[PDB]
Structures are given as structure tokens and as C-alpha cells.
């Protein structure tokens with residue numbers, strides 16, 4: 034197999050090699066995945082390449098009355114999975130966001146099937162975490 | 178807690194309380210779950226109610242190249258999980274399908290928290306079988 | 320009375336149902352000798368792992384029948400809404416057919432839910448093994 | 461070679477890097493950065509886990525729990541959470557995982573160790589610097 038230190042161009046074609054539809058604004062660096070927006074509660078998901086590391090991250094908006102209970106359950110959520118990470122991103126002017134992410138290190142090179150397996154295992158664990166929080170009525174709906 | 182014998186109206190109301198979208202061909206006796214079909218491999222998943230038994234089942238199309246290795250792997254797949262079940266459905270006009278299901282008996286009643294945990298554990302454990310089977314290139318995409 | 324049962328709760332529940340069980344010093348499973356009256360059933364036990372109750376029965380498969388039995392494992396599993404069947408094969412063991420059902424108790428169960436779990440287990444498990452025994456796929460006990 | 465390693469392959473891989481482990485368990489425990497009372501390597505469901513545990517002083521459980529989100533967002537690869545049982549003191553778990561379902565190389569594992577040690581010790585160094593852990 035090949036072992037690539039993948040650039041942004043490498044991830045763009047690898048995703049199309051997997052049939053994954055992606056989106057990217059003009060001067061930006063994130064590769065947004067609209068396929069992740071069919072999971073209930075998922076407002077946005079994107080692939081990022083920072084410091085030789087791939088970051089599959091999805092974002093869900095927390096109900097303001099659920100912020101404290103969800104914050105207390107972050108350790109149990111992070112312990113529920115061997116790969117997924119969950120934390121609260123809360124800004125003054127924004128609504129509280131639940132960021133769920135998983136990282137793949139590409140410093141020493143990765144293979145295409147390593148990246149493929151990483152994406153779908155990420156979008157399975159991220160799916161189960163966000164879908165479980167929406168089952169607890171902790172998130173806001175993604176539609177009007 | 179309330180210990181109920183649920184009907185198909187109880188389940189979809191419970192699914193609504195869980196924020197789970199369900200689609201129902203009014204020709205269909207089951208509650209189809211579109212959230213489960215974005216897992217690559219799964220082409221359909223549904224919640225059924227037959228003889229006081231709730232059936233969370235997901236179906237994936239198997240590559241004809243892999244029905245023999247997958248059939249030999251059914252024992253290790255079923256033994257890999259305490260709750261889920263996995264088998265093949267092979268007719269003659271349609272492609273072979275892998276069925277991954279989980280079962281919950283309701284004839285002696287069930288609470289809301291028991292059903293919620295059933296759906297949660299079913300969706301996790303089924304998706305891992307589908308995710309791993311797709312990693313071994315045993316399934317057709319959707 | 321929604322309880323998250325321990326193994327001691329399972330022992331007392333089987334006694335309330337008049338169902339004899341057997342448990343060693345070393346182990347942790349509650350073997351049920353009543354299931355051994357069914358032809359081909361070598362052993363049946365109740366386990367409790369990861370907040371899940373596991374009623375499983377085991378049958379020794381004839382070596383010449385291993386491939387045919389494996390072939391219609393899918394049909395056996397599709398034959399019921401609750402039963403699970405698979406093959407257990409080690410290098411020093413005779414091949415085994417494991418027929419089992421599971422009831423997760425993570426969020427609690429009632430004594431009535433457990434009573435029906437074991438009765439539906441014994442019915443569905445026996446009808447699988449006895450039909451495989453009627454197809455000349457199992458060894459005598 | 462791209463390999464799905466067992467525990468023995470991880471044993472030999474730690475041998476190749478000059479890193480010692482404790483003989484035993486199912487993890488490979490490893491033997492300074494004050495706060496941590498145990499660090500180990502786990503192999504669970506085709507996933508290698510490098511985790512370190514530090515006992516939290518009860519006077520800091522609520523503050524540290526409030527900072528868990530900022531701690532997890534400060535790192536690209538490491539995860540932090542609390543493990544609180546009724547008979548133990550509250551523990552802080554700092555972990556980084558390397559999934560291995562589709563194999564792994566030896567330098568992918570070697571860099572996984574180097575990256576986790578520097579990222580885990582960066583979390584443990586900061587919490588202990590803020591008087592959140594026990595000696």
C-alpha cells in the first residue's frame with residue numbers, strides 16, 4: 034500500500050474515491066460533509082488538516098436549559114467510546130455548541146484504507162454520541 | 178415507572194419523545210428509521226412489532242463476491258455481540274442481503290426507559306457489525 | 320419493582336420459579352439441568368455479563384455435519400424472532416452449536432419479564448436444537 | 461509491515477523503542493511528570509489506547525469538571541475526562557487512541573507514543589500546576 038503525508042488535495046480526492054460528497058468555501062480549509070446532516074441534531078461536520086493531523090468534527094447546538102446537565106455528563110460520554118471526543122463550545126453571541134470529534138495522526142504517513150476506515154468509524158461514533166444526546170432532549174432541531 | 182404493553186402507536190410516540198425521525202409507508206407495518214441508512218452499507222432499517230416482540234433490524238446489500246466468506250463469518254459475528262443477530266436473506270431476483278437485528282419482548286410489558294435503551298444499544302451494536310463488515314469490503318454501497 | 324439484578328437476584332428468581340440450577344465454586348454461571356432432557360442439549364446456563372442476561376444452550380455437532388449446519392445457520396436464525404444460533408469450534412474441542420437468547424437488564428427488569436424470558440428461551444432454544452437433532456446434525460448426549 | 465498487532469507485537473514494539481513496561485492485567489503499564497499515578501497501553505477492540513490517570517483532590521472536582529471542555533479543545537489528539545467511583549478518589553484520565561482495524565506501521569505506533577506522551581504530559585502538567593491533583 035501507499036503511505037502518504039496527505040495534503041488538502043490528497044484528502045479531496047480520497048473522499049471522492051469513497052463517494053463522499055464534500056463542500057469547501059473559497060479561501061477556507063475545512064472540508065464540510067453534507068452527508069452528516071441527515072443525522073438528527075447535526076448542524077455541521079467537516080474534515081480539517083492541522084499540524085499533520087486530520088480532525089473529523091461534528092457540531093450540534095445545545096439547548097440552553099440542558100447546558101449544565103450535559104456538561105456534567107461529558108466525562109461519561111467521553112468514557113463511553115474509545116475513539117470519540119466530546120466537549121462544549123460556548124460563545125457569548127453564539128448558542129452553546131456540542132463539538133464531537135475524532136482525530137487521525139498523519140505525521141508518519143497513512144494509507145488510503147486507513148483514512149477510509151477512519152472516516153466511517155468517526156461518523157459512526159460521532160453519530161451515536163449526538164444521536165444519544167438528542168434522545169436525551171439536549172439539542173435543538175436542525176430544521177425550522 | 179409505567180409498565181405498558183405497547184402498540185405501534187406507542188412506539189412511534191416513544192420515538193417522537195426520543196427525537197428520532199421515523200418514516201412510515203402507510204403500506205408498511207414497521208417504522209423505518211432514515212437516520213440508520215446514512216451508515217454506508219445499510220440500505221434500510223426499521224422497528225417492527227410482531228407477536229409482542231419489538232424488532233430493530235437493519236439490512237445491507239452483500240456483494241455477491243463475498244456471500245461465501247460472509248456466510249462462514251456469521252458464527253464469529255453473532256458470537257462477537259451479546260445482543261445482536263446476523264444472518265443472510267438470499268432470494269433469486271434481489272441481491273443477497275445481510276440482516277442485523279435486535280429483539281425485545283414486550284408481552285409482559287415494557288417501560289419507556291427500557292425501550293429507549295433497547296433502541297440505543299441496537300443502533301450502536303448493529304452499526305458496528307455493519308461498519309466492520311463494510312471495512313472488510315463485504316457490502317455494496319448505497 | 321424494577322431491579323438491576325445481580326447473580327444472587329437471578330438465583331433467588333429461579334428458586335421462586337421452581338427451576339433447579341447448579342453453580343460451582345469456580346464459575347459464575349447458573350447451569351439448568353432441566354434443559355438436558357431435550358435430545359442433543361449438552362448444557363444450558365444463565366450468564367450475566369455487562370448488564371445482559373444470557374440463556375444459552377450447547378449441542379455437539381457431528382463433524383460430517385459441520386458444513387451443512389453452517390450453511391443454514393442463516394435459516395435457523397431467520398426462523399425465530401428471539402433465538403440466536405452460531406457455531407463454536409476450537410482445535411481440541413468437538414464442534415458445538417450454541418443456541419441462545421439475551422435480555423439486557425441495564426435499565427432494570429421485573430421478575431415477570433425474567434420469568435417470560437426463561438420460558439420463551441427454553442421454548443425457542445429447544446425447538447432449534449431438537450430440529451437439528453431430527454436432521455441428524457448432533458451427537459448423542 | 462502493515463500489521464493488526466496483538467499485545468505481544470506491542471510488547472516487541474516497546475522493546476524496539478527502548479521503553480520498559482511492567483510484567484503482569486491486560487494493559488502494559490509504563491513507569492515522573494507529577495500528578496499521574498499510572499500510565500498504560502490498552503488494546504481494546506482493534507484500538508490501541510495510551511492513557512494516564514491522576515487522582516484529583518476533591519476540593520477541585522467541580523472546577524476541573526467545568527474545565528474539561530476547554531482542556532479537550534486545547535489538544536488536537538488527547539482526551540480528558542473524570543472517573544469517579546464511590547470507593548476511590550476521583551481520577552482524571554488523559555488518553556489518546558490509535559485505531560488499528562486496518563493495520564498499523566511501526567513508526568505510526570512509535571509516533572503515537574511520542575505524541576501522546578507530550579500531549580498527555582501537557583495536560584497533566586497544567587492541571588497539577590493549577591493545584592487540581594494529588595501527589
Ligand SMILES: [Cl-]
Nearest residue numbers: 092122130132
Ligand atoms: Cl465551529
Ligand SMILES: [Cl-]
Nearest residue numbers: 377407415417
Ligand atoms: Cl461453552
